[PDB]
Structure 1
Amino acid sequence: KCTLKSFTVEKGIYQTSNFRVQPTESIVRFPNITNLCPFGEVFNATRFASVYAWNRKRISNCVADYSVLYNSASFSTFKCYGVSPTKLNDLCFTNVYADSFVIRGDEVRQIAPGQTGKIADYNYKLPDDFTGCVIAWNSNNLDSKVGGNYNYRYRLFRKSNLKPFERDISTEIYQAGSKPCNGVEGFNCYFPLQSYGFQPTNGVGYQPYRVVVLSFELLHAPATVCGPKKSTNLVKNKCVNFNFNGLTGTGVLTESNKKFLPFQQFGRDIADTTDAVRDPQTLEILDITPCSFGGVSVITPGTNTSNQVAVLYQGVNCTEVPVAIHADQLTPTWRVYSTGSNVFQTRAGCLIGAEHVNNSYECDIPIGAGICASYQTSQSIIAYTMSLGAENSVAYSNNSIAIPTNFTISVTTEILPVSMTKTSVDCTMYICG
């Protein structure tokens, strides 16, 4: 009735809903690690690097807790790209990389994917598709050593622009003048590092700021940096919700006969989705098998005739269908439709509430693969193999003929559609009006 948007239902078979076996529990699995990541040495280094020669550290083989960063009031920005920072304690990574330096406050504007300005062009470049977070804060109270702190340095020309994550150290003179400068200064021949005058009295845009940038290695290999999340025991051969290493979903987890090669960590379908995993705690190879599914064709006489009903669970086996009652999640779900007195395995799927019969009749409601159903005598929806017609051995012999001695003049009615309703639409009045 809710499929057809109607209170009356006429006789037939209707594709109402899609039964799926449901997640019984949530299963969580992560690598065997407890040792904390070195975030204090990242965020509280005594002096941060010069932005021409910025620091970069690989983080691996550890447990993080990004709340210790994200919920600290100590930061002037915490901007992230491709991840909402809330998710960082659930999600996890093969490695993380922390880049770090001091910069002028006006130039923090340049520290983003695809941003433009002298530092972004010549001495610190993020790729346009960066995944991760930029953390920066004012450091005028630490890094403004009276005024002449020209150890903090950057670029403006030299030769050519900078690639994403390209390190540089080089010391050849700027040749902005036409002359081959050959290590000697002149008009437009000059020293190849520009520098900052960090006085503690500077206006905020001219003040120093400390920077950390986190890039996250979401590659397909095993995870080694993960959040404070706790694993469960494994479940097999029953439908469950899951999370392995941050790969979430619902499935019947099982042992697998798939020969993964030693470096293969996951299996994938044509549709890009995962179908198999290696357990990070057990090292066993497991199918993330889809929980079994099938269209719920509901078979009915007219509601004009009876409100008794049968259900075909399409494709599924009568041994596998587990619903029984609304304790499994709502579609047919009324308290008999998986384990009743009459249940029958058609090749189209498990047929329940209909009563199998050894006769054959002309096909009333078609079910499929030679099976039909009808409402008959104390009434029930019977189900049977369809009759093709009455059987007849023609009385053939090499010298016998039958000749008709009489006739009948039949009148037969044949009905044909010839034309349909001539509609017209004003699309500006339909769309806008």
Structure 2
Amino acid sequence: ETKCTLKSFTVEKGIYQTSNFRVQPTESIVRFPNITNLCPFDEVFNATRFASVYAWNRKRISNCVADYSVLYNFAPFFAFKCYGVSPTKLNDLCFTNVYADSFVIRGNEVSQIAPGQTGNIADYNYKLPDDFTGCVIAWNSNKLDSKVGGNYNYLYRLFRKSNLKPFERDISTEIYQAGNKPCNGVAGFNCYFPLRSYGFRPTYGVGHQPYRVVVLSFELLHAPATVCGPKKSTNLVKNKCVNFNFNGLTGTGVLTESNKKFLPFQQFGRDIADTTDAVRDPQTLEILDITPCSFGGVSVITPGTNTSNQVAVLYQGVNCTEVPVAIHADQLTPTWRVYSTGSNVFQTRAGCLIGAEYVNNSYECDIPIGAGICASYQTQSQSIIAYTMSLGAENSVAYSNNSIAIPTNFTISVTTEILPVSMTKTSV
């Protein structure tokens, strides 16, 4: 691994930071609410009559298991466009409530049902919020919403004082003041009836034929969820590294009993950097605390590959007891586990050192390990030893108050000193 990291077939004496070890998870668990009754997705899509645009109705869906793959057979639509979520995994998420709206418009204005759009129908009739998170479905209904004589049951507002706020409905029928004349009368010039009727007939081509529209609105926030997809819960395991799925929010780590005082309207717990730290179990009202797996840097102490072929391994910042826990079959991110805990395990304040033996000697520092510990390839027939660095040789000085030492000879010494002055000049 050291050779692969250095991109060379030879290595020199030193200590190299190769990689990071991590403990792999054992199994996976799923925790979803225990809900059985199906959702009423037939009334929304299969109805004999649809409300007009100016009086669009809203239906609440909650406390049921929602399968979104069945509504494909309920209406002959083609697009099924969604904004805040991919339609592929709508079955893998848990929502807190669903809202279904339905109406009938002209084919021209179907493009106006979108966030940030304005027009005749997105200003005075139905305006989506700028941060919409849901789906819009529209399909042609010319064969059952347009008569040869003409259809007049569909109304829409064209005149009003000001643009209406998102998800707000206005059903007032009063004469608009469109002139200096006081519009007190029932009707007249400069006084317009704000509601106009469609003319759906088979004669009109595409773009003028009636279209039937259903809008599904979700909200993906942290709150007690009622409507959920069709997934089966498993048992609850504790104190072991597993893959948990609490109401659709996946993760990885160990779960422990927690002593955090939550509140009935609080379900999740966060911290700085905005990551989940505590969860409330959906099936049973219990609080669990998530802790990540065990990880640690690993370093390889080696003499020059020319000199020998033995290495020692330093696990940085871990106590020597968890290394056997870390060293398990099919449970460690590094593939190699040949070292494991095979003797010569020594606890340094820098970390746990494996493959090197400790001696009661003191030499100069060859390969610095840290915290006053060094290592070197030496004899006790040749192995790798780990010792404590020596600052020098002990030497007591002599002091007396009536004695002085004077030299009687001299020496001339010539030394050398090297200093860089400049580098290369480059151009790009």
Q: Is the 8 A contact 1:265 1:278 kept in 2?
A: yes
Secondary structure, counterpart of 2:44 in structure 1: helix
- Measured in 1, the distance between the counterparts of 2:401 and 2:84 equals 86
**TM-aligned CA distance change 1:138 to 1:386, over 3 Å:** same
Q: Is the 8 A contact 2:142 2:202 kept in 1?
A: yes
Deviations 1:102-152 (A, max 9, x none): 111221111111123211121111112211111111122222245443231
Q: Is the 8 A contact 2:23 2:332 kept in 1?
A: no
Bigger Cα displacement from structure 2, 110-119 vs 332-341: 332-341
Q: Is the 8 A contact 1:326 1:334 kept in 2?
A: no
**TM-aligned CA distance change 1:412 to 1:6, over 3 Å:** same
Secondary structure, counterpart of 1:332 in structure 2: coil
Bigger Cα displacement from structure 2, 344-353 vs 14-23: 344-353
Deviations 1:133-180 (A, max 9, x none): 111111222222454432312222311112211122222222233323
**TM-aligned CA distance change 1:159 to 1:364, over 3 Å:** same
- Measured in 2, the distance between the counterparts of 1:177 and 1:417 equals 89
Task: Give, in angstroms, the shift of residue 2 of structure 1.
Answer: 1.9
Q: Is the 8 A contact 1:93 1:223 kept in 2?
A: yes
**TM-aligned CA distance change 1:139 to 1:421, over 3 Å:** same
Task: Give, in angstroms, the shift of residue 306 of structure 1.
Answer: 1.9
List runs of 5+ in structure 1 lacking aligned partners.
Answer: 426-433
**TM-aligned CA distance change 1:414 to 1:217, over 3 Å:** same
TM-score (norm 1): 0.91
Deviations 1:212-232 (A, max 9, x none): 111111111122111112222
Task: Give, in angstroms, the shift of residue 70 of structure 1.
Answer: 4.6
Deviations 1:69-91 (A, max 9, x none): 25767213200112110111111
- Measured in 2, the distance between the counterparts of 1:398 and 1:422 equals 62
**TM-aligned CA distance change 1:379 to 1:45, over 3 Å:** farther
Q: Is the 8 A contact 1:324 1:335 kept in 2?
A: no
**TM-aligned CA distance change 1:373 to 1:101, over 3 Å:** same
- Measured in 1, the distance between the counterparts of 2:421 and 2:85 equals 60
Q: Is the 8 A contact 2:25 2:331 kept in 1?
A: no
Secondary structure, counterpart of 2:90 in structure 1: helix
Secondary structure, counterpart of 1:121 in structure 2: coil
Task: Give, in angstroms, the shift of residue 261 of structure 1.
Answer: 3.4
- Measured in 2, the distance between the counterparts of 1:73 and 1:27 equals 36
Bigger Cα displacement from structure 2, 235-244 vs 77-86: 235-244
Task: Give, in angstroms, the shift of residue 205 of structure 1.
Answer: 1.8
- Measured in 2, the distance between the counterparts of 1:121 and 1:213 equals 17
**TM-aligned CA distance change 1:393 to 1:86, over 3 Å:** same
Task: Give, in angstroms, the shift of residue 304 of structure 1.
Answer: 1.6
Q: Is the 8 A contact 1:325 1:335 kept in 2?
A: yes
- Measured in 1, the distance between the counterparts of 2:78 and 2:261 equals 51
**TM-aligned CA distance change 1:97 to 1:392, over 3 Å:** farther
Deviations 1:33-52 (A, max 9, x none): 12211111222233121111
- Measured in 2, the distance between the counterparts of 1:155 and 1:358 equals 94
TM-score (norm 2): 0.92
- Measured in 2, the distance between the counterparts of 1:142 and 1:406 equals 123
Choose which of 36, 56, 64 in structure 2 pairs with 1:62.
64
Q: CA RMSD in A?
A: 2.2
Task: Give, in angstroms, the shift of residue 183 of structure 1.
Answer: 4.5
Q: What percent of counterpart residues are identical?
A: 96
Q: Is the 8 A contact 2:42 2:74 kept in 1?
A: no
- Measured in 1, the distance between the counterparts of 2:402 and 2:29 equals 81
Deviations 1:268-306 (A, max 9, x none): 231111122111123221122111212222221111222
Q: Is the 8 A contact 2:159 2:195 kept in 1?
A: no
Residue of structure 2 in register with 1:278 after alignment: 280
Secondary structure, counterpart of 1:197 in structure 2: coil
**TM-aligned CA distance change 1:399 to 1:230, over 3 Å:** farther
Report the number of matched residues: 425
**TM-aligned CA distance change 1:124 to 1:321, over 3 Å:** farther
**TM-aligned CA distance change 1:180 to 1:321, over 3 Å:** farther
Q: Is the 8 A contact 1:50 1:102 kept in 2?
A: yes
- Measured in 1, the distance between the counterparts of 2:225 and 2:80 equals 24
**TM-aligned CA distance change 1:388 to 1:261, over 3 Å:** farther
Q: Is the 8 A contact 1:158 1:173 kept in 2?
A: no
Secondary structure, counterpart of 1:424 in structure 2: coil
Q: Is the 8 A contact 1:275 1:287 kept in 2?
A: yes
Secondary structure, counterpart of 1:107 in structure 2: helix
Map 1:271-350 to 2 at 5 A: 271-321=273-323, 327-328=329-330, 331-350=333-352
**TM-aligned CA distance change 1:223 to 1:398, over 3 Å:** farther
Task: Give, in angstroms, the shift of residue 18 of structure 1.
Answer: 1.5
- Measured in 1, the distance between the counterparts of 2:91 and 2:41 equals 14
**TM-aligned CA distance change 1:26 to 1:401, over 3 Å:** farther
- Measured in 1, the distance between the counterparts of 2:403 and 2:74 equals 106
Q: Is the 8 A contact 2:243 2:252 kept in 1?
A: yes
**TM-aligned CA distance change 1:2 to 1:50, over 3 Å:** same
Map 1:6-405 to 2 at 5 A: 6-70=8-72, 74-321=76-323, 327-328=329-330, 331-377=333-379, 378-405=381-408
Task: Give, in angstroms, the shift of residue 345 of structure 1.
Answer: 2.2
Bigger Cα displacement from structure 2, 405-414 vs 324-333: 324-333
Bigger Cα displacement from structure 2, 246-255 vs 142-151: 142-151
Q: Is the 8 A contact 2:105 2:210 kept in 1?
A: yes
- Measured in 2, the distance between the counterparts of 1:369 and 1:175 equals 86
